[PDB]
């Protein structure tokens, strides 16, 4: 069972730093070249660095050439990212990946990848979320099925989790990825039931975001 | 350094059918007899997998459906009877030169026959106006294939400003694609008017769905 766990992520203030660090766990660490390796979010893979088995050569990708420092601890084996000086492009989910040799060493390839951590530069304070019910009109509803949703607005930090109904109502729904305007963050959620159950039923939505310790259980009630 | 350009962005495929995505370098990615260049696969919110490395050699736990060959600049991945655990991102990767890069990717996606949207629009709610804000959201649920656009009207023209989107990935029951668009305006301005409109354009239709509510109700 060969595996790389990451851990260190987190939130940091732009121009803060913050220290990664990665736990191997099945192999001989002390021979295997290292990388990091880093994903935006929506966005593509970026190599960000590379050490030897041997701490011998490091490479650093421009973008964090004078900011980031890689290093390695054969004893304990794990491989180890310092970040500072960071800004708001350093935003990304921070892989942890072993290179390896098919004929030798410059032929080298990514061979194990980790789950790795998140890491989030920003200026923005924890703010829990607006839950705003979104009901239809009285007679602007027609057919049989009706769709009504939940509005989850500028919240810091990611994630937030929706439900409706608990869960009773898994079916037809759809909760949007969130999408940071400004820098704050703002999702919403649809769920779709018959007509004769709504206003005659509730309907709730349950969104839950841990950073504030917040959960709200928003009842979506008809407009007068 | 060097640049990968995959294509297509995205392939909308059968399951049983035969897959062929390709991956081309700004500059030669061959070393001494050999390339430098690797298929890695990846699923939501999950980290890559490799699938091949050297430009032919299968990783060793891959299915014999997948294959891989080229060289020079051209490469390409095969998964000829393509199934449902193939479903997913698939990126190219050098190690030539450094910075070592990555291609763009391609999205592999169930194809399916066309949907219309279903459009849904929703004024601000009371607790929103409260704190002097007014968003609209309107919803386009399961549609296909991906591509749509969405455009606002307020009481008659398109407004541009403030208007936020999102989509859900591609749906593991019906196969189809949803958005969510939001319009946010501050409460006054949203009431110095009386018509919101959510327009969608999509393939199946060349008339825009059109879906709006008028104020005073």
């Known amino acids: 069972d060969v595996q790389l766990v990451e851990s260190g992520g987190g939130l940091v203030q732009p121009g803060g730093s913050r220290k990664l660090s990665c736990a191997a766990s099945?192999?001989?660490?002390?021979?295997?070249?290292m990388h990091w390796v880093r994903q935006a979010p929506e966005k593509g893979l970026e190599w960000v660095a590379y050490?030897?088995?041997?701490?011998?050569?490091?490479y650093y990708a421009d973008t964090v050439k004078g900011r980031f420092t890689i290093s390695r601890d054969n004893p304990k084996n794990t491989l180890f990212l310092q970040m500072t000086s960071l800004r708001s492009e350093d935003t990304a989910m921070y892989y942890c990946?072993?290179?390896?040799?098919?004929?030798?060493?410059?032929?080298?390839?990514?061979?194990?990848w980790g789950a790795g951590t998140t890491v989030t530069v920003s200026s923005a304070k924890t703010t829990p979320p607006s839950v705003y019910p979104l009901a239809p009109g009285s007679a602007a509803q027609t057919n049989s099925m009706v769709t009504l949703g939940c509005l989850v607005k500028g919240y810091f930090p990611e994630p937030v989790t929706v439900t409706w109904n608990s869960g009773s109502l898994s079916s037809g729904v759809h909760t949007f990825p969130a999408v940071l305007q400004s820098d704050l963050y703002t999702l919403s959620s649809s769920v779709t039931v018959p007509s004769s159950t709504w206003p005659s039923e509730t309907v709730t939505c349950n969104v839950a975001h841990p950073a504030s310790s917040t959960k709200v259980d928003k009842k979506i009630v008809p407009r007068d | 350094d060097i640049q990968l350009t995959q294509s297509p962005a995205s392939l909308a495929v059968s399951l049983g059918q035969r897959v062929t995505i390709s991956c081309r370098a700004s500059?030669?990615?061959?070393?001494?007899?050999?390339?430098?260049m690797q298929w890695y696969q990846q699923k939501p919110g999950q980290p890559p997998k490799l699938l091949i490395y050297?430009?032919?050699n299968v990783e060793s736990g891959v299915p014999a459906r997948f294959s891989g060959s080229g060289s020079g600049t051209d490469f390409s991945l095969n998964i000829h009877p393509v199934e449902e655990d193939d479903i997913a991102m698939y990126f190219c990767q050098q190690s030539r030169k450094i910075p070592y890069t990555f291609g763009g990717g391609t999205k592999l996606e169930i194809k399916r026959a066309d949907a219309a949207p279903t459009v849904s629009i929703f004024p601000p709610s009371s607790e929103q106006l409260t704190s002097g804000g007014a968003s609209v959201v309107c919803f386009l649920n399961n549609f296909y294939p991906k591509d749509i656009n969405v455009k606002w009207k307020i009481d008659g023209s398109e407004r541009q400003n403030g208007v936020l989107n999102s989509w859900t990935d591609q749906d593991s029951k019906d196969s189809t694609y949803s958005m969510s668009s939001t319009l946010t305006l501050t409460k006054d301005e949203y009431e110095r008017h009386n018509s919101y409109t959510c327009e969608a354009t999509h393939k199946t239709s060349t008339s825009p769905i059109v879906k709006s509510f008028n104020r005073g109700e």
């Open positions: 050490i030897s088995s041997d701490s011998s050569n490091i």
């Open positions: 990946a072993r290179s390896n040799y098919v004929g030798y060493h410059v032929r080298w390839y990514f061979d194990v």
């Open positions: 500059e030669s990615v061959e070393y001494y007899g050999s390339s430098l």
């Open positions: 050297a430009a032919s």
């Open positions: 099945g192999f001989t660490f002390s021979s295997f070249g």
